[PDB]
Amino acid sequence: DRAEDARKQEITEQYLNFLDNQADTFHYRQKIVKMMNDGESRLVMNLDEIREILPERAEGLLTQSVLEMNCLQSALQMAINRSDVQAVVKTGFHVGFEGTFGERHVNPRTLKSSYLGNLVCCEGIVTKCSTVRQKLLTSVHYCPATNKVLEKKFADFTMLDTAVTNNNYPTEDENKNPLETEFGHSVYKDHQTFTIQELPESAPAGQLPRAVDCVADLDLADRVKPGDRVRIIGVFRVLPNKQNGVSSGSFRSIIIINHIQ
């Protein structure tokens, strides 16, 4: 376990040195300054540029994508903390990717279970859309009986973070005093789902075209409508299911989006 902690410290240090190099050859520090002046909260990186300076990070970022991406976003937060500009945004800062994918450029027909857990880039036509809806992230409560403030965090399978918790909404103190929600301090995020189908120029003749489901959050919501031709970058993942303690072995799969073109 401690070796895993040491490796994560090493990986975050490598990404932090790449981001906040003393004379930045790739100018991502100046792009961070532009991002914080504009009030945006995600940074777009060239995977081909990471590939030159840290190829052992870049090729591992495709196969072991979850741990590498978590380490990269932690390094981005430390790089922001070194600035003289202040972190206004209550949601964290995020990363999207562009570049050369090769093996992992796919279609809804060719996305199959060998690719689960990997970063992928996929193409198609938007065929459905949910309306934008708000989702709880953290809740802040005031205890009037004791003048203390309680907080709670929430997590879900559709989020990149693997960690899980009880997800019960708190109502009482440990001393069973009642609690009051602070709506001005609790944190929510915008949420949307959609689906993409094969392009009609590529689907083989006679057969029905195949399709894939997609999840988008925060600034990526409210960007698409039906009929749009899109290229989408994200992690391909699987979702379990339960009914009365009996589980069918057939699970559902989605793409958790990082970036849209």
């Binding site: 693997t162 006679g206 699987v238 379990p240 339960k242």
Partner: protein, 541 residues
Amino acid sequence: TGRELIAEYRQLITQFRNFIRDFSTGGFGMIYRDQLKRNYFSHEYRLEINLNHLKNFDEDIEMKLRKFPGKVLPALEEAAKIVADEITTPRPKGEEKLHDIQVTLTLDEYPTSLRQVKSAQVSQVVKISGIIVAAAQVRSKATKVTLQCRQCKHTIPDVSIKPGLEGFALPRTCAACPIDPYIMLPDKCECVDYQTLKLQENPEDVPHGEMPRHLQLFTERYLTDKVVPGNRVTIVGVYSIKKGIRTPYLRVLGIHMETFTTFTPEEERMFKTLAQRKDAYELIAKSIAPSIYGSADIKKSIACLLFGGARKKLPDGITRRGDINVLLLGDPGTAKSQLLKFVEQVSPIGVYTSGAMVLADGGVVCIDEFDKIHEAMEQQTISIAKAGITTTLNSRCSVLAAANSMPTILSRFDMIYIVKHDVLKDATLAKHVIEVHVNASAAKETMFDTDGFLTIEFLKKFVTYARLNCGPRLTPQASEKLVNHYVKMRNPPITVRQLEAIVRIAESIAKMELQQFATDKHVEEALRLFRVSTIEAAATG
């Protein structure tokens, strides 16, 4: 009593290892050993076994494999994995991981009728024949899963799930915590592909005056995406009941199927020999529909329709069409539908019909009964704006139309014929045609055909070759004649549409000879064809 089952399982693994190693056709020919080695180095982690070979090697394990497949078959897969490790070691660096191998079966017997699977055959291996009628999208199924307790976070790893359309039940209470406390980690499980199909019994075997029956099929890993609706198949699989009444389904163990753009130097030399011949254009026109008498200029026009002109895009972006369109008028007889069916067979892509207009990008559509679209013909596109929809459908094709008789749509057709006192010549034609039909009754009782006409299988390939390779232009001397002809006809219904149609026909004639350029010869033949076709409409009606 688990050690007795362990003894049985290890004994089965020993016997299947001996079968894979020792079966031979004589000499050094150990067929399954060689096939497994070749598959593993081809990165296909599968093997296929014949049960009659297994029955000759050892009858008892074959009988057990048929009657208890869910118990016995994992031992065979494990034995295949062990033998593959023995064959391939020591593997090169980076390839140390040992892969997991799927075993499939074949069986030489008569298939069971789909209506006559006895209820005693549940959970046994059976062989069935039929037609695939539907095929769903590929999905993922979990093979091994990891469980964690919600409260105290104790884990159960590598819980394995049985195959097929079977669920599994989680532990009710914690092993180390309310009712049903375990959850499944999305990141630490293993998955494989699966697919669902639907099988219909063969229409030959349906009893008289009844509808066919159906059965559902389950396929896994390398048996997915092997079939399409309409295929005829024979299947070996386990007869199962889906999880006091249950519906049945078949878990597939083996499938057996019951059923251009690339050329050789021989094919190129054959095409070039025909192109080198002087009578090539007349020979192709003769080769169109030899069973139907006469109609020489119409057959020449159909050849021009098949080959088409060149297709152009100038620097300002305005494109110029290559397709050619032909219309036939007159009496409803004289084998018009048979000509359309011949063009449907010969064309590289095409459709016959009485939407349908869309479905032939780069192809040919034959329309019968045309007296039953202007945007489709000219723009190669149709558009719509009704309540709640506006779209455009775009497709490129040539059209051959047959009518039995609007003056508006006659502008859209490049060539028009009126088919129209035969009786004395028709006596000789009646003799020939009835002799053909009596010879067909007697029958009821590769460049060239026997009669010197070109074969369909050569002609179709030659058209597909020429379209992707020729692309001609006009010579300046060929261009000089058309200007004088246009001015003379217009100042003695003359339009630029007709001028461009004549240019397209001249390019189409030069395409068949595989020319770099069209000349005065091709222009004069194009002008003759245009006059002979179009002036019939000026004279008549």
